[PDB]
Design an enzyme around this catalytic site. Structure first.
Site, PDB file in Angstrom:
ATOM      1  N   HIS A   1    -107.280 -33.374 -85.205  1.00  0.00           N
ATOM      2  CA  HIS A   1    -105.926 -34.035 -85.210  1.00  0.00           C
ATOM      3  C   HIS A   1    -105.410 -33.820 -83.737  1.00  0.00           C
ATOM      4  CE1 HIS A   1    -103.967 -30.288 -86.615  1.00  0.00           C
ATOM      5  NE2 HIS A   1    -103.223 -30.622 -85.736  1.00  0.00           N
TER       6      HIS A   1
ATOM      7  N   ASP B   1    -111.048 -31.824 -90.606  1.00  0.00           N
ATOM      8  CA  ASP B   1    -110.251 -31.620 -89.368  1.00  0.00           C
ATOM      9  C   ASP B   1    -110.772 -30.441 -88.454  1.00  0.00           C
ATOM     10  OD1 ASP B   1    -107.883 -32.541 -88.245  1.00  0.00           O
ATOM     11  OD2 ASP B   1    -106.868 -30.785 -88.515  1.00  0.00           O
TER      12      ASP B   1
ATOM     13  N   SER C   1    -101.381 -24.998 -84.000  1.00  0.00           N
ATOM     14  CA  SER C   1    -102.273 -26.046 -84.432  1.00  0.00           C
ATOM     15  C   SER C   1    -103.589 -26.019 -83.604  1.00  0.00           C
ATOM     16  CB  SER C   1    -101.771 -27.424 -84.572  1.00  0.00           C
ATOM     17  OG  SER C   1    -100.402 -27.453 -85.260  1.00  0.00           O
TER      18      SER C   1
END
Ligand SMILES: *[C@@H]1O[C@H](CO)[C@@H](O[C@@H]2O[C@H](CO)[C@@H](O)[C@H](O)[C@H]2NC(C)=O)[C@H](O)[C@H]1NC(C)=O
Lengths: 36, 259, 15
Positions: B43, B99, B205
Site C-alpha cells: 500500500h 499487502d 508502515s
C-alpha cells in the site's frame, strides 16, 4: 567474505557479532517462556 | 511509533525508509533482506483510494539511518530502485490482503555495521516462534500519537522508535474489527485488560515486525506493518502481513532457490 | 507523510 548475507543475516554487527545485548532484548526471550 | 523507547545505534541494521524525492518526505519504512532487495507493504506504493501509485522515478531508498531528517553523511547509504514487484492478488479494496512488495536496488549496497539484513522465516522458526503471546519488536520513525491533519508539535520522532508488542490470538484479531481478516495477516498488541500500551502508527508502515530466535540467535522478520484502525486504541490491534504465509511469492520473485 | 523539513541530499538523485 563472510557471506552475501546467505545465513549471516539477523546477526547484528554492533550486537550479536559483538557479544552485546540490547536494552529491550530480554523482554522478548522472557515472553517466549521456554528458557535454556 | 506509539509508546516506545529510543532505538540504539545499530539496534536495527535492516531498517530502510522509503523517502520521496519531490517533495522530499518520509513515505514508509522498509526492510533489507539481501544487498539488493528491500521488503515493504504493497500500500506504500499502490493505493488507488489515496490516489497512490508511485513509479521507480518517485522513490529513494535510505538505509542505515538513525535520525529522522538528518542526512547522515558518514553512516546512511542512499540507493535507487530498479523494478518494483507488487503481489498480483493484492486486495487493496476489500481488506488490504497480500499487502507485500519487493523493490530491487539498482546497486547492491556496501553493507556496514548499520546496513545489515534480516532473516526470513523457515518452517521451524515460523512454527516455533509465531505463538500467541510471543512478543515482536517493531521499529519506525512514524507518528508518536495518532494524527489526521498531521505534522509536528512533536508528533514525529527524532531518532528510531522501538516497541515490543506481543502477538494476539487470531479469534481475537477477527473479533477486533469488521474487516475480513485472512490467514495472510496476523495482529499484535496488548489486550485492553493488560498492563502495557504501545503500537505502530502512521509512518512506520512497511516497517519490519521482527523476532529473535531463542534456538538460533539471529533475527527473523515475521511480518511487515500493514494496517491498523487508529494508533494505540483500546480494543483495536495492529495488523501485519504474514511474511511466512507469503514466502513462496518472495522466492518466486527473487529466484534465490535450489543450490 | 507530511513535512517538517528534511535536510540536504546530493542532488544527482533529483537530477
Ligand atoms: C501505476 O501502477 C501500475 C501497477 O498497478 C504500473 O503498471 C506497470 O505496468 C507494467 C505493464 O503491465 C508492469 O510491467 C509493471 O510491473 C507495472 N508497475 C508496477 C509497479 O507494478 C504503472 O506503471 C504505474 N503508473 C504510474 C504513472 O505510476
Amino acid at each position: 567474505t563472510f557471506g552475501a548475507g546467505e545465513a549471516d543475516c539477523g546477526l547484528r554487527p554492533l550486537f550479536e557479532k559483538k557479544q552485546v545485548q540490547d536494552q529491550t532484548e530480554k523482554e522478548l526471550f522472557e515472553s517466549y517462556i521456554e528458557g535454556r | 511509533i506509539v509508546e516506545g523507547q529510543d532505538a540504539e545505534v545499530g539496534l536495527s541494521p535492516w531498517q530502510v525508509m522509503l523517502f520521496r524525492k519531490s517533495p522530499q518526505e518520509l513515505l514508509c519504512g522498509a526492510s533489507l533482506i539481501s544487498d539488493r532487495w528491500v521488503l515493504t507493504a504493497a500500500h506504500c506504493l499502490l493505493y488507488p483510494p489515496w490516489d497512490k501509485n508511485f513509479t521507480v522515478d518517485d522513490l529513494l531508498v535510505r538505509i542505515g539511518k538513525h535520525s529522522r531528517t538528518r542526512y547522515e553523511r558518514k553512516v546512511e547509504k542512499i540507493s535507487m530502485l530498479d523494478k518494483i514487484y507488487i503481489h498480483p492478488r493484492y486486495n487493496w479494496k476489500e481488506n488490504l490482503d497480500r499487502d507485500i512488495a519487493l523493490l530491487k536496488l539498482k546497486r547492491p549496497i556496501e553493507l556496514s555495521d548499520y546496513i545489515h539484513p534480516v532473516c526470513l522465516p523457515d518452517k521451524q522458526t515460523a512454527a516455533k516462534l509465531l505463538h500467541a503471546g510471543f512478543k515482536g519488536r517493531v521499529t519506525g520513525w512514524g507518528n508518536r500519537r495518532e494524527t489526521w491533519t498531521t505534522s509536528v508539535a512533536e508528533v514525529q520522532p527524532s531518532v528510531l522508535q522501538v516497541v515490543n508488542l506481543p502477538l494476539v490470538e487470531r479469534p481475537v484479531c477477527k473479533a477486533s474489527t469488521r474487516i475480513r481478516i485472512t490467514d495472510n495477516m496476523f495482529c499484535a498488541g496488548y489486550k485492553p485488560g493488560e498492563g502495557k500500551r504501545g503500537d505502530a502508527c502512521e509512518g512506520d508502515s512497511g516497517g519490519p515486525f521482527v523476532m529473535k530466535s531463542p534456538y538460533n540467535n539471529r533475527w527473523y522478520q515475521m511480518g511487515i506493518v500493514s494496517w491498523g484502525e487508529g494508533c494505540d486504541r483500546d480494543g483495536k490491534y495492529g495488523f501485519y502481513t504474514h511474511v511466512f504465509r507469503l514466502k513462496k511469492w518472495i522466492q518466486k520473485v527473487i529466484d534465490r532457490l535450489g543450490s | 507523510h507530511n513535512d517538517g523539513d528534511f535536510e540536504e541530499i546530493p542532488e544527482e538523485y533529483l537530477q
